């Protein structure tokens, strides 16, 4: 499959927030 | 207390000393005095609404300023045809200070 639309800035950043490291 | 006056096809609520904005009175220069036809007078509990009584009451006001309002930007548009008319407008106004409300 292929992305139907360019992802809106809000939606892109909602997700990348989840890609965070944990404090040891 | 205050009186209702018509100033160019528009009504207003005015008390002595108020500065109000009205459609341009082209005949009057700055400092001139203009009489406004009153439509209601409220003085405490006394409400004067008889038109025959009111026909003799004229609210006296002084022409304070001639100025122009903010600029309004106008656009006509219809899609897929290329029609587009752009236009600007600044409505001209006169500020008058109410001086007297004869009883």
């Amino acid at each position: 499959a292929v992305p139907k639309r360019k992802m809106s800035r809000s939606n892109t950043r909602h997700r990348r927030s989840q890609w965070k490291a944990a404090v040891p | 207390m205050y009186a209702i006056v018509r100033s160019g096809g528009r009504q207003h609520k005015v008390a002595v000393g108020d500065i109000v904005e009205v459609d341009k009175i082209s005949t009057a220069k700055v400092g001139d005095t203009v009489e406004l036809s009153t439509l209601l007078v409220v003085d405490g509990d006394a409400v004067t609404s008889d038109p025959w009584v009111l026909a003799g009451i004229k609210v006296q006001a002084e022409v304070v300023d001639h100025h122009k309002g903010a600029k309004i930007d106008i656009l006509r548009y219809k899609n897929k045809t290329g029609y587009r008319r752009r236009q600007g407008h600044r409505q001209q106004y006169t500020a008058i200070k109410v001086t007297a409300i004869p009883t």
């Binding site: 890609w19 965070k20 404090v23 | -």
Partner: protein, 111 residues
């Protein structure tokens, strides 16, 4: 007492660098070294090397030897000049590969 250092053209993608720099914002300077020390990520090595220049500048240049009243005031990673190379793939085509770089800055101030 703002003293700062930065490493420019550090070969690690900006997002991978931000993953680590977002841990060390607003903690004691020494306590931040003890966090980058025990950090799995491989970006924690260049970042801690910059965090030590900031403390070294604070001690030397501005004479704030005591490195225990310091906290990370600012820390941010800026994008750097991207390099562009290709990769042969199926049926004679080629897809581009960008080797991104970053500019890491760290600022230590007195509490």
């Amino acid at each position: 007492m703002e003293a700062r250092a930065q490493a420019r053209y550090i070969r690690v993608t900006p997002m991978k660098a931000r993953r680590v720099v977002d841990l060390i914002r607003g903690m004691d300077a020494t306590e931040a070294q003890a966090v980058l020390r025990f950090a799995p990520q491989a970006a924690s090595v260049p970042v801690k090397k910059v965090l030590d220049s900031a403390i070294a500048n604070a001690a030397h240049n501005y004479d704030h030897t005591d490195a225990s009243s310091l906290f990370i005031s600012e820390a941010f990673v800026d994008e750097g000049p991207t390099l562009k190379r290709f990769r042969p793939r199926a049926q004679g085509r080629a897809y581009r590969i960008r080797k991104r770089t970053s500019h890491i800055t760290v600022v230590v101030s007195s509490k």
